[PDB]
Amino acid sequence: PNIKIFSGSSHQDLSQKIADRLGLELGKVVTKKFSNQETCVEIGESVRGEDVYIVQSGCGEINDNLMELLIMINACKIASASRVTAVIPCFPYARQDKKDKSRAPISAKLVANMLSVAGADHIITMDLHASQIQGFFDIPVDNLYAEPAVLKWIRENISEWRNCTIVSPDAGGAKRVTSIADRLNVDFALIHKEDRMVLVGDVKDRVAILVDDMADTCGTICHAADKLLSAGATRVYAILTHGIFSGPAISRINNACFEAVVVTNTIPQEDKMKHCSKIQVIDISMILAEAIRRTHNGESVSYLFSHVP
Amino acid sequence: PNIKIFSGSSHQDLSQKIADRLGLELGKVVTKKFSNQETCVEIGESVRGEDVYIVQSGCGEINDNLMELLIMINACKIASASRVTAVIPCFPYARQDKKDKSRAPISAKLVANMLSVAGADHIITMDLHASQIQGFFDIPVDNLYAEPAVLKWIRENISEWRNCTIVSPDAGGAKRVTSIADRLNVDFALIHKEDRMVLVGDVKDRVAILVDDMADTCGTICHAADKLLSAGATRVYAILTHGIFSGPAISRINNACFEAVVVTNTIPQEDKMKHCSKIQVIDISMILAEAIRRTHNGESVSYLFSHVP
Amino acid sequence: PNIKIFSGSSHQDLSQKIADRLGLELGKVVTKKFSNQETCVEIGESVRGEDVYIVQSGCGEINDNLMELLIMINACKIASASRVTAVIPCFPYARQDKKDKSRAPISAKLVANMLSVAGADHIITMDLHASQIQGFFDIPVDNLYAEPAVLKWIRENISEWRNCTIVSPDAGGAKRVTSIADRLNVDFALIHKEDRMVLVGDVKDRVAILVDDMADTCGTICHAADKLLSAGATRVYAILTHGIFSGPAISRINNACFEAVVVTNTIPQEDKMKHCSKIQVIDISMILAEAIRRTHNGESVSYLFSHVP
Amino acid sequence: PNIKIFSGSSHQDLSQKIADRLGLELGKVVTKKFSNQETCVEIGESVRGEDVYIVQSGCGEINDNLMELLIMINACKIASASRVTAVIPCFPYARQDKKDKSRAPISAKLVANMLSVAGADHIITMDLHASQIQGFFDIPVDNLYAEPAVLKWIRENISEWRNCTIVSPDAGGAKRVTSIADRLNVDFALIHKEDRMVLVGDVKDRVAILVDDMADTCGTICHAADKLLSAGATRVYAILTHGIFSGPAISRINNACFEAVVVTNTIPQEDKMKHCSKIQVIDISMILAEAIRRTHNGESVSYLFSHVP
Amino acid sequence: PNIKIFSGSSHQDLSQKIADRLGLELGKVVTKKFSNQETCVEIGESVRGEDVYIVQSGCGEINDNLMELLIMINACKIASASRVTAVIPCFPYARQDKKDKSRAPISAKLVANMLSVAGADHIITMDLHASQIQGFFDIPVDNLYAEPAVLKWIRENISEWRNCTIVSPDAGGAKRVTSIADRLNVDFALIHKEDRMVLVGDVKDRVAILVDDMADTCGTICHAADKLLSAGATRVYAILTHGIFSGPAISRINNACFEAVVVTNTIPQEDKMKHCSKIQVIDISMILAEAIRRTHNGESVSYLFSHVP
Amino acid sequence: PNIKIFSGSSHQDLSQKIADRLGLELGKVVTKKFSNQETCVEIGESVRGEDVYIVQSGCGEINDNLMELLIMINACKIASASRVTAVIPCFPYARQDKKDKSRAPISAKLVANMLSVAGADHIITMDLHASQIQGFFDIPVDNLYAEPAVLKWIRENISEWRNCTIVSPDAGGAKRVTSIADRLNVDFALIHKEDRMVLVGDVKDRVAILVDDMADTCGTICHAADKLLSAGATRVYAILTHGIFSGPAISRINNACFEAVVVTNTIPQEDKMKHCSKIQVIDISMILAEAIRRTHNGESVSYLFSHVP
């Protein structure tokens, strides 16, 4: 059983980078739309008794990409692939992980069920919005962390990183920032809204680094950055693993005080970089490639939680 | 347990017509998109211990509508609805019902599995592309027929209907046309391609009526109509239950010789009627409403296979 | 994991031919009936961590054979076989693939569900009545084609095959005949009933070849052959992949004008050949053996759709 | 939701008796065989939102009857019956309830799985060979007892019943006989083979009553009766809930010393009574009818374990 | 894929013995309780693509041990183990294998379902209370037998074993004793209660050996031993595969006439041996180790039904 | 370990045919000459832990091709290929298999030694000039036979093959012709030179078929054909497995009386067919492909000695 890497249409550059790091050519697949907008998928090579990895992120036209992924999984499964793994760098509907006093769907659970019923045997993803989403599956889920790469970027790009403060934009992300604050041996601050925001932790004359899983409309991080500049911070950075940047995010970032907005490339960023000078990208394709290769060879994946490969 | 009718965004006029025929107000639901294009659904009323019917056709932005339907089904199911029924007038991915010497998905089966796993207890649909799709489910599926309404339209709109010929555009649909030919006591002709088409059955000086389940790009029916005019037909009609009309269909129909292109309203047609004079619509909302009401009251649904209500 | 081939009682000659082509001895199994007619199965060898293939066709005493197959699958699965494959040359209840305005079962779907619940991981079959039956499963199904062998037989047995006409007995099978007509570069004709039959396509002074998936009572092909002789055909052949020949089929064929009735050996034919001189058999055991060997070795099975091994 | 009773072809007299006791007409169903021996089923009336009971015993052509039952269950389930119950007076493959140092199937578990996957919601049966078969299901199973009726027959037919000895033919059935011995306040004896049999318990000058679940070939009960006459018994009776009587059973009973062989009518007995004078039948249709009516009305079924209705 | 053996807290000595016989070190796992008595499990080594065997018997604090086993199975399954096997020497809730005229659970079936849903692919157990419990699973179950070891113990410890009588304490276990009686070529006796017990079979001046699957409170075997001494037996032994010895069992055995009470070590016995001199233990770790090694290597397990390794 | 097929420059068409039959792309290799005519080889893909097959025949510039093959074998072996197989359809220096009263080399043995020392683990060849060359190796050698294909060609191309005579050109090849004569049930004749030739066996009015391993200069077969026409033969064919056709062979064949000169394609023939009308080619790429696939999968190769795949 050999590795076969197939790309969905969502993020073809990432799939190519992963394939090069694996020393493979991207599997031959045709993924387009019929005239009536139904997703047309044709696997261009035999996947029999192979270990198939399908790379597709929850970005762009999310429902189209999700249906493409499900259809590709189904095609590979009924084509007698030995094992089918969904490599989903940004998990779609991850923020709909609970109901919370609303007659709402748990869309993340529905997506997990659909992936399972399509025939996925394994999920590889990066920085799930809530790690409880792992429990939405009955198949194994490897939730990788961009932190090795975020810490690397911070050390090699922020000269004052030893005196910086890692800041959570909200009470929800505090855990994450504390983890980073522990690995850098720096202070960590929290910010919560009461339209006013309250900040705990000295940030005067120090570089502040907001950290988060995802920036969609960037209202949260822009308000946090305004508050950080109010409290005497020298420069404010924002580091996010998922740069969705939908709606007015680009205009708000352009009007914000960020020195840089660093995001990983779980979502393609070339178009946003054109219209926003201060967006920067951290490659995490090495982490994804190493996770694929370790799942294939039966080596430890959790080794990657703390080690940059 | 009362009837609750909810509309997806795909076909709101049809849902309203069904609700009026049932004497009900469309259930309160908010169905929109978040900024990052994730489907947001909020059920605006309690559906506890109710018999819920969600109307959504496989039309327009098909993957968006399908995800909306699945999310709404899930929301109603975890909101403790007694029973959830998907009313899908045009079934999405119905034409992907087999592999046939290709490493292709069976997308119709995947859609059926997704509907089942979302929590659908029952499916109501009209003129499935292949009735074998009924076997793709383990829940009951009521496949209604537009034929009572097509026959009604033919009798009240084609003055020469007793001397007409019902024509299949291809060998696949012959069964359907024979059924119609049996109910009208008229001749039936077949047309098959060898770029040339061959026609069996006298059509000279007689009105010809092409009959089909769906017109997507209308290449099939336009070629058939050209052949029918070649063979001395007086006028050529086309009657389809599903008027998808994607791609170049409107231009081809405008350049074709059809007297009329009659389609049912399983798919909204107002925009296409603006740009195509010869499109006409047969209301099938009475059949759908009667099917809903009979499933709710435990009356016979198959009664509708031969009776216009 | 090695190949183990087990024979049901339905078609032992075919199982032996397959085993010889694989270079194996048929797995030791006792398959008989208790006094009260319950199916007794005993696997006479260990199948642990083996790739098990059970050969059983839907022929003869169909319900007995189907229960035998399910019981054997269950016995191998709880005996810790690594993988269990059902090799079903003629799929039982394949013609009950839809309801169609009747309160009828979808028996083909029920059979698929029973095979899955017995523990089948994979299905190998030949010329499914409707390829949509593939969607009745969630496990992979390889639907082989007898066409490579039918084309071979036509070329080596009909001297006038370049000027012949391939004829469908009904509108349903037209696809199949067109495929054959494409591979031979000959004309193709259709025949449909209006008790009268209508034929499209010149057949005068030409050899006609009716083609079909199955001959049960042979009313269809006998009526078609009578019509073909009415239309001036020189000789009429019939080629079917499944020769069920139940009821009055043998008498009708004996009284018909067929030059030959060629069937594959998916169903044993020795008894019918005794009472019908014009039945001939095309061996497809090479296709089945190659499919088994390719599924075992992870080679391409679809290679066989166009290549005689 | 109303009661609909449908009969399989196995035991139509029992189904009619049950229908009369319920005050209903047997549901309209056509259950025959196609020419090629495939089971043809057509439900002749709507079963929508009804409580459907299908009566079929594991007797006669067992695999044919079992397939008929599964097909009928499937037809009713996809016809949108509110609930489907299988009334199986004699459960097929019940004696294959374990492996026991053999590479054998657990056929009873396979049958249970097939019934569940066909869509049965509930099982009603009488005197399961092993009550552990109840655990083979995940749906509720009501295992009725013929004992109220056996005790009634014993009291009204054996004048010396107060001085009789209830005898188990083997060590396996002892529980059953003890139950009966407790309800009659009589002695109970056991018989076990060491070709020789050993009997414990005084039987001289006393009427002996062998009791068992089923007589298939009647070797067991005939050997037991020979031993009982050897030990000075006055008359020997045999009472069995299931009179299968396959193979040489009728000849052995005719040559045996039984005063009577009483069986229930879970299996039709008219043909056997023709060739065997000493077979007598205890009607249990009242127990089955009361169980059906109590499951329908939500009354206690276990009330019937001790009360003759 | 390598063997990984993990121990639950129930029987660590047995797990160590098995690990030594396999030439392996027990897998690193932490299995303790949090303060609030929730089971805490941490797998201390990677189990990716490994063949995992978790040893846990149904003994001691049964519900705690069962939950520990389920949690460990789940942890290994979501840690991407290739296969997870539960090695359960004494199966918990095995005696709750049926309802029998009681509104009782079938707890054995519930345990089987829980093991399956936790992710067990395979079960290895010894002397199931009823072999029908095998049918409660859909995964393969290997039910080993202590009989090779019981027969070995009898021959090497009872000098008069050729003239002994094997005795069943009740009618239920007779099968077992007959098996033993067949393998030793000795007489077999039965004992059943009518507070009085009746014994069939000469036992005077002969050594009697009661045989059973399990001794919980030992009322059954103590009453049987009293009866055997009443009937002139010289010495009475008791041999049980599962020595649960709960409640007053130790006091009753101490006051009983047994020469020895031999049990296997499916349940730890050191504490009971302290307070009961006549308890002796037969090691069955060789049978369990050989079964593990044969399932891993794909060799025949049933070979062990008759051969001591 | 996967199959990797690499082509030398000698016979690229054959390598491509083999690769297509295996469903593979020819391995990437650069095989050219430096300016000073040293053979330059570069393996363009990783062959680590792969099963490598290098196809190179002893044809054309024989010493260049042999050195290319040795260099490619060495490159693959020091690149850590798991196994390296030389597929040599025509074995070079095969005719130098002995000394025979001459101070000559045994060049075939030298070639075998060089292949072994380069690192070949296995040899696949067709119709070795002397099968004793197999003993020149210590590695396994599979010597395939073109006979299945020669017999096939004879039956499908020579209408009088049942009355033909198979003729050996010399006493050395008699064995071969007898084999063929046995498989066709025809007469076999020998021809030996005393410049005169003597023929044993009636050939008058019968088609004669000279059979041989190789035609280099074709003096032997041309003299034999002249003698056969002298002895009253009707037509003379020549069938050779290796068509070397060096020196004056083409002119002699053009001036000879052969109806056809059939050779296999172990050596490329396109150039010779241009200048010689009566040369015909029998494809043996199926035999070579099947041998490669069977050696890879561990199936029987000798199965091919008598079976055309």
UniProtKB/Swiss-Prot annotation, chains A, B, C, D, E, F:
Record annotation: effect of changing D195H: In a breast cancer sample; somatic mutation
Name listed for the protein in its UniProt record: Ribose-phosphate pyrophosphokinase 1
Annotated gene: PRPS1
Pathway(s) this gene product operates in, as recorded in its UniProt entry: Metabolic intermediate biosynthesis; 5-phospho-alpha-D-ribose 1-diphosphate biosynthesis; 5-phospho-alpha-D-ribose 1-diphosphate from D-ribose 5-phosphate (route I): step 1/1
Cofactors that this protein relies on: Mg(2+)
Pfam family, one: Pribosyltran_N
Role description: Catalyzes the synthesis of phosphoribosylpyrophosphate (PRPP) that is essential for nucleotide synthesis.
Disease: Phosphoribosyl pyrophosphate synthetase I deficiency is a rare condition caused by mutations in PRPS1 that lead to variable disease phenotypes including optic atrophy, retinitis pigmentosa, ataxia, peripheral neuropathy and hearing loss.
Xref: InterPro entries: PRib_PP_synth_CS, Pribosyltran_N, PRibTrfase_dom, PRTase-like, Rib-P_diPkinase, Rib-P_diPkinase_bac
Phenotypic consequence of N113S: In PRPS1 superactivity; no effect on Km; resistant to inhibition by ADP and GDP
Nucleotide-binding among keywords: yes
Species for this entry: Homo sapiens (Human)
Binding site residues for Mg(2+): D127, H129, D138, D142
GO terms (BP aspect): 5-phosphoribose 1-diphosphate biosynthetic process; hypoxanthine biosynthetic process; nervous system development; purine nucleobase metabolic process; purine nucleotide biosynthetic process; pyrimidine nucleotide biosynthetic process; ribonucleoside monophosphate biosynthetic process; urate biosynthetic process
Catalytic activity: D-ribose 5-phosphate + ATP = 5-phospho-alpha-D-ribose 1-diphosphate + AMP + H(+)
